[PDB]
Amino acid sequence: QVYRGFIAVMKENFGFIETLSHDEEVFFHFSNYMGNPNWLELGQEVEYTLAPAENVRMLPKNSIPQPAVLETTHNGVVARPLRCINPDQQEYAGLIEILDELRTTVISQHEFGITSLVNKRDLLQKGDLVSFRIDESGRAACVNAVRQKKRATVDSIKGQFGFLNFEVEDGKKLFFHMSEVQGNTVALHPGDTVEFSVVTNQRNGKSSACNVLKIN
Amino acid sequence: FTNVYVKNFTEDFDDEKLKEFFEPYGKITSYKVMSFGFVAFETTEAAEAAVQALNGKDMGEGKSLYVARAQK
Numbered sequence: 001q002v003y004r005g006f007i008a009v010m011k012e013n014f015g016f017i018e019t020l021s022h023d024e025e026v027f028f029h030f031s032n033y034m035g036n037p038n039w040l041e042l043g044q045e046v047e048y049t050l051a052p053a054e055n056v057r058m059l060p061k062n063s064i065p066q067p068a069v070l071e072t073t074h075n076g077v078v079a080r081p082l083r084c085i086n087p088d089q090q091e092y093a094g095l096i097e098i099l100d101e102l103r104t105t106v107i108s109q110h111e112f113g114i115t116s117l118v119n120k121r122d123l124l125q126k127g128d129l130v131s132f133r134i135d136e137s138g139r140a141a142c143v144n145a146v147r148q149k150k151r152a153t154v155d156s157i158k159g160q161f162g163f164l165n166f167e168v169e170d171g172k173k174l175f176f177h178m179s180e181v182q183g184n185t186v187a188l189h190p191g192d193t194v195e196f197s198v199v200t201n202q203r204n205g206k207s208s209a210c211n212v213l214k215i216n
Numbered sequence: 217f218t219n220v221y222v223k224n225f226t227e228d229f230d231d232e233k234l235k236e237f238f239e240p241y242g243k244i245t246s247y248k249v250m251s252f253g254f255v256a257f258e259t260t261e262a263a264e265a266a267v268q269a270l271n272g273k274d275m276g277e278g279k280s281l282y283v284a285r286a287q288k
Contacts, residue, residue: 072246072256074219075286098221099287107221107286108252129287138250 004064007044008114009084010037016084017046017053020064022113022139024092025083028053042120066115067136074098075146078128082113085123096130096140112140119144121179122209125202151195151214154188164194168206174198175207182212218263222253223282226275229253241266 008025009016015037017026028048030037033056045059079095080086094116098107110132114120116139124130124145133142152166155173166174176196181188188194196211222234231249238244238255242262247255257263263285273281 070246070248072219072248072254074254075288077287100284101287103287105284107223107284134248134250136250 002047002049004045004047004059006064006113006115007040007042007046008082010040010042015040017048017056018092018114022093022111022115026050026053028056032056034058043115067139069133069135069141071133073131073133073142076110076130076132076140077103078124078126078130079109081125084114085125094124094140096132096143108138110134110138110140112143116140116143118142119209123199123201123207147197147199147209149195149197151193154190154192154194156190157188162188164196164208164211166196166198166208168198168200176211177207180209180211182210185213188213218257218260219286220255220257220263220266221284221286222255222270223284224279225253225281226277226279229275237270238266241269 003020005017005019005026007015008018014027014029017028019026026048032054035058045061045064046056047059048056076096076098079097080089080091082094083089083092093111093113096110096112099105100107122145129146131144131146132140135141150166152164154162155165156163161175161177163173163175168174193214194211195214196208198206199209200206220238229249234247234249234253234255235244242265243258245256245258267283267285270281271283275281
């Protein structure tokens, strides 16, 4: 009846709760949430009653005990992504693998969920090189993707999203949303230089992540 | 600051045996077994020295120690 978990997906009028074991997802409607939906974080600890969830209650931080995260930073490659970005697969949790130098022998595997990612909105597909730490359960923690940084100039702006002078698919300009800009800056103009990373959906097209304005 | 990963050891392998096995090669700042195991060295030369001296050590019971660095 009564469970506990973390917020994994937040959409328009609905969302999903990652279970306590990080191995399943529970759907819940915003009408059954006790509080403001806009004030709800990703990875937020919640307590919910099952019907399909109902009566979702937000919890204070560290209310759900979790394994301690070790200090050493490791490097790995993604094998399975989360089902939140890939509903095709059967397994829910993602998989990170530490490989040998020849990239052919598996040293160890480490599962990850929504609470394992530094950027909860980050798009981690198979083949991405990541930097992460390990918790006491063996799961991946502090997961961050290693991507080569690019830098171009802002070309245009249309509302809450614009384009850079970076050519990707069939000579197109790189898309970027204002939700990826750093600092507290409201001033972003065509001609400004930004340093960014290039993320790409393996089912469709490309985007850009974490772009900070470089103007000195 | 290069990590070394241990794999396929005996059942009496503890956190201390892992430290005793790898400390005569360099300064260790972090290590853990976790059911597989790893060691964090300060200098990268202490890591390359430990891999060449412990991969295939023979821990007994037909167990050969797999010691290797990670992909990059």
